[PDB]
Amino acid sequence: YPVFAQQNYANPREANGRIVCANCHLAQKAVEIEVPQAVLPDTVFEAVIELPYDKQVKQVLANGKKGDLNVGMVLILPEGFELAPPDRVPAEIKEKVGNLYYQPYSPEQKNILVVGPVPGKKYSEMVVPILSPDPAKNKNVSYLKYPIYFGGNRGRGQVYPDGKKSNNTIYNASAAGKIVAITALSEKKGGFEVSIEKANGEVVVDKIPAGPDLIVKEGQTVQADQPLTNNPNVGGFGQAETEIVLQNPAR
Amino acid sequence: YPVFAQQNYANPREANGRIVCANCHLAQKAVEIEVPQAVLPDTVFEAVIELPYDKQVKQVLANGKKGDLNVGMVLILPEGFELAPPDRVPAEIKEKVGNLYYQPYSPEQKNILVVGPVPGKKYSEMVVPILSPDPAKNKNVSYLKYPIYFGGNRGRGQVYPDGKKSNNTIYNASAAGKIVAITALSEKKGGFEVSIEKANGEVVVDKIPAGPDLIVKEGQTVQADQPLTNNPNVGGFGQAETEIVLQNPAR
Amino acid sequence: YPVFAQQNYANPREANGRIVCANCHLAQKAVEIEVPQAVLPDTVFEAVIELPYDKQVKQVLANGKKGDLNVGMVLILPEGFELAPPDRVPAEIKEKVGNLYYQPYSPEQKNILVVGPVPGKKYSEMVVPILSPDPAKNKNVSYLKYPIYFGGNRGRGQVYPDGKKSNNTIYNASAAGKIVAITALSEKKGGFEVSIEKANGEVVVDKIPAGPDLIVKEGQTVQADQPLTNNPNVGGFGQAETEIVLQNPAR
Numbered sequence: 001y002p003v004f005a006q007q008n009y010a011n012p013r014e015a016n017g018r019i020v021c022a023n024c025h026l027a028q029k030a031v032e033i034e035v036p037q038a039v040l041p042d043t044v045f046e047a048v049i050e051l052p053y054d055k056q057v058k059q060v061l062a063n064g065k066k067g068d069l070n071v072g073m074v075l076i077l078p079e080g081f082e083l084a085p086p087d088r089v090p091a092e093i094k095e096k097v098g099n100l101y102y103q104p105y106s107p108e109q110k111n112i113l114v115v116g117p118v119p120g121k122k123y124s125e126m127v128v129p130i131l132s133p134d135p136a137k138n139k140n141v142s143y144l145k146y147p148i149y150f151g152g153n154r155g156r157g158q159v160y161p162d163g164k165k166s167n168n169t170i171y172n173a174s175a176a177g178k179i180v181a182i183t184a185l186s187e188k189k190g191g192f193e194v195s196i197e198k199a200n201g202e203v204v205v206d207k208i209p210a211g212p213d214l215i216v217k218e219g220q221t222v223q224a225d226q227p228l229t230n231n232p233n234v235g236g237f238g239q240a241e242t243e244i245v246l247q248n249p250a251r
Numbered sequence: 252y253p254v255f256a257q258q259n260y261a262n263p264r265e266a267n268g269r270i271v272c273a274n275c276h277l278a279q280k281a282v283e284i285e286v287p288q289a290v291l292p293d294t295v296f297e298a299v300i301e302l303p304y305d306k307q308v309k310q311v312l313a314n315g316k317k318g319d320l321n322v323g324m325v326l327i328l329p330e331g332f333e334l335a336p337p338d339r340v341p342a343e344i345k346e347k348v349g350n351l352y353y354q355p356y357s358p359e360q361k362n363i364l365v366v367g368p369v370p371g372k373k374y375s376e377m378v379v380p381i382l383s384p385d386p387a388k389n390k391n392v393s394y395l396k397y398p399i400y401f402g403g404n405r406g407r408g409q410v411y412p413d414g415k416k417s418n419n420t421i422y423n424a425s426a427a428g429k430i431v432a433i434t435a436l437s438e439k440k441g442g443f444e445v446s447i448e449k450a451n452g453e454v455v456v457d458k459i460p461a462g463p464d465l466i467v468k469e470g471q472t473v474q475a476d477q478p479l480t481n482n483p484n485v486g487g488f489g490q491a492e493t494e495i496v497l498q499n500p501a502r
Numbered sequence: 503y504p505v506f507a508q509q510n511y512a513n514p515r516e517a518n519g520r521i522v523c524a525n526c527h528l529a530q531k532a533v534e535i536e537v538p539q540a541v542l543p544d545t546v547f548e549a550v551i552e553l554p555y556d557k558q559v560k561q562v563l564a565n566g567k568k569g570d571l572n573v574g575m576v577l578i579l580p581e582g583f584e585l586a587p588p589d590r591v592p593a594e595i596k597e598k599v600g601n602l603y604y605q606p607y608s609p610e611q612k613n614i615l616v617v618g619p620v621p622g623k624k625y626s627e628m629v630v631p632i633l634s635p636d637p638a639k640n641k642n643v644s645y646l647k648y649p650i651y652f653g654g655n656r657g658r659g660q661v662y663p664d665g666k667k668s669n670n671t672i673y674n675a676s677a678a679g680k681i682v683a684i685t686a687l688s689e690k691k692g693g694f695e696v697s698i699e700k701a702n703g704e705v706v707v708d709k710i711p712a713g714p715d716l717i718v719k720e721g722q723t724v725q726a727d728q729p730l731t732n733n734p735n736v737g738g739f740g741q742a743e744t745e746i747v748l749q750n751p752a753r
């Protein structure tokens with residue numbers, strides 16, 4: 001979740017421009033963002049983001065069951081830009097925003113906003129109220145064309161903060177050998193146990209949680225790291241970059 | 252504690268199933284819950300929950316020493332279901348339950364119960380006396396197969412409501428540089444103070460409470476937010492789910 | 503803006519005499535400046551500048567729309583000359599000067615004045631109240647014929663300090679190929695996305711902000727750097743040079 005990024009990465013955007021969500025949300029899926037080409041200083045504007053996907057397709061949940069997807073994002077704005085205060089957000093805009101609670105990536109990064117998890121059904125499109133800075137009061141900001149970086153995700157990740165794989169990813173053979181057995185993990189607790197008899201005769205047992213479907217058969221020989229299941233993931237992460245000009249007014 | 256969730260989260264369960272304890276109890280540790288396949292209306296059934304862990308493995312305590320772990324949990328029951336009143340719990344069951352005090356998440360949420368902190372050595376397994384609602388009198392409940400969500404934790408968390416870290420977690424360098432000095436935080440209580448000479452001459456001192464162990468030496472160089480200690484945490488949070496059929500008496 | 507020059511160029515005039523505004527305001531447009539041929543020591547005189555342009559012609563704004571042009575300038579006076587303080591400017595002149603706030607290029611360069619952005623509608627002609635030095639006190643100056651350099655602009659520039667293009671300039675193809683598609687960058691705010699399929703099947707997408715007009719069509723084949731739009735710029739930067747004699751009054 002955005003909280004996983006926050007708790008494990010001080011900067012959500014890596015040197016090459018990759019947003020850290022990608023370190024765990026391994027599938028790529030297009031997203032979009034639009035902001036006005038230009039805005040006056042100390043003015044509230046809207047950032048409209050889209051995280052499209054097929055609402056009819058459900059995902060594997062942590063409990064192994066199928067369910068709806070949820071969305072989240074991280075928006076990296078120029079230094080000085082901030083989430084617009086509620087007292088600066090017009091009712092018409094609060095209406096478009098809805099019941100969302102944008103938060104700064106950290107108290108020391110008010111220019112980086114996150115939100116989520118929130119229902120994909122209702123928030124595949126979101127509006128972010130942003131307050132532009134004033135170069136006349138903030139020496140760290142100028143009347144320039146500034147880049148804006150966006151990262152948007154839908155669906156559960158493939159790996160956890162501890163490095164363990166979630167049940168929403170591909171599982172591969174720990175060793176090469178003949179599959180001598182495939183046992184159902186339980187009755188309520190789905191999953192499987194794949195026994196691989198190595199060339200030396202030792203048997204290893206690979207545990208596979210419920211979620212992914214097996215693509216291997218008993219008696220089948222597999223190579224080490226060969227996929228033993230398909231990929232159950234139906235979600236993905238996408239990035240988009242845009243820009244905005246902080247106008248320099250004067251009459 | 253379960254109270255932290257109560258004081259900070261209105262709903263302990265998020266849309267995808269994640270239970271809020273996960274926000275501060277970063278370690279994942281399986282748990283189990285079992286209830287009868289079905290139950291008649293207005294009847295007391297027992298929910299048996301387990302929070303297994305090696306009782307021989309001591310955890311880091313707040314004072315810096317190693318000691319026993321406590322357990323806690325949040326149980327999400329369908330509306331209408333509540334803790335069975337004492338006058339409805341048979342002597343036999345009260346004896347199994349023990350001196351546990353299950354409390355509603357809030358006065359308006361009797362269908363959500365919590366317990367803890369309580370000694371894991373004595374409560375690694377618990378019995379919760381539940382009273383099934385009566386569709387005949389409660390129109391908000393019907394004869395359906397109802398889900399039951401459980402979240403159980405053992406061991407101290409890694410972060411508090413305000414973001415501060417406990418001493419039962421990993422401490423990382425607050426800045427990149429070379430460790431020019433490592434001093435004891437407390438002469439007698441342990442803990443450390445690692446002085447890091449930044450790449451700009453400026454020296455910073457990172458305080459490390461007693462509890463975790465240092466994995467860096469004097470003169471060593473470290474990167475921004477690089478592990479200065481191990482991860483002392485031996486506990487964990489886990490979620491389990493189940494279901495029960497609210498039976499309609501024939502005749 | 504004049505501030506871009508101030509923040510990026512220590513000296514607004516290069517050795518060859520080109521004024522730094524020209525590094526970003528690529529269209530040359532005549533300007534005029536007049537100062538009397540001579541002035542007495544410690545005397546307030548006027549510099550009358552003209553930044554002519556067709557007031558009926560609107561320019562492209564940063565937001566993509568059309569609007570008025572702002573003007574600004576840099577005035578390089580001989581060492582010792584400065585903006586005449588208010589107490590030394592006759593109401594007659596202050597009235598001509600209007601509500602303009604001439605400022606030194608930097609605190610150390612009182613002899614170099616800048617102003618703007620200000621509306622060209624009202625300030626296409628400006629009056630600058632200058633105080634001549636006195637070789638009797640400022641021995642760094644004498645009774646000579648001194649050069650004066652002027653740089654005046656109107657309209658938005660073509661490139662920012664970081665090299666990014668503004669939307670008030672020509673956009674060219676990033677690579678040679680055939681335009682396989684042209685879509686709106688913004689559904690309601692304009693702008694375009696030109697898809698160029700180059701020889702080896704690869705496709706690149708050039709983003710053109712709202713402002714310039716496309717001079718190309720889908721199905722058309724272009725060459726690298728070939729203009730994809732017109733030049734929306736209707737403003738311009740001009741320089742002028744004059745001189746003034748610091749008189750040595752009979753004694």
Ligand code: HEM
Pocket residue numbers: 001002003004005006008012020021022023024025059061062068069070071072073074114116117118151152153154155156157158159160161162166235267269
């Ligand atoms: C970082 C800014 C970031 C975003 C964006 C993000 C979003 C996100 C959402 C919306 C969910 C819920 C999806 C759903 O369909 O329910 C979610 C879930 C998981 N994430 Fe995530 N996530 C971001 C970053 C990261 C990082 C850096 C990690 C881990 C270190 C990570 C991992 C995961 C995992 C695992 C899940 C699934 C949780 C589960 O229910 O099993 N994410 N993320």
Ligand code: HEM
Pocket residue numbers: 252253254255256259263271272273274275276310313319320321322323324325365367368369402403404405406407408409410411412413417
């Ligand atoms: C919510 C339902 C929830 C549970 C379950 C839970 C349990 C729990 C226990 C039983 C302890 C004590 C364990 C021990 O060995 O002493 C405990 C301790 C801490 N918790 Fe917790 N906790 C739940 C939720 C949360 C939340 C949301 C936070 C904070 C915002 C949180 C944090 C912590 C921390 C830190 C501790 C350590 C306290 C200390 O001894 O210093 N918990 N929790």
Ligand code: HEM
Pocket residue numbers: 245247248503504505506507510514522523524525526527561564570571572573574575576616618619620653654655656657658659660661662663664668
């Ligand atoms: C320096 C002495 C200098 C002057 C004079 C000048 C003036 C100027 C004005 C008055 C404007 C506003 C015009 C309008 O119609 O809105 C303006 C705008 C831009 N400038 Fe400029 N400018 C001078 C110098 C420079 C320099 C050296 C740069 C860049 C490093 C530069 C660039 C631009 C750009 C681009 C703009 C457009 C800003 C926008 O509205 O998007 N100028 N300048």
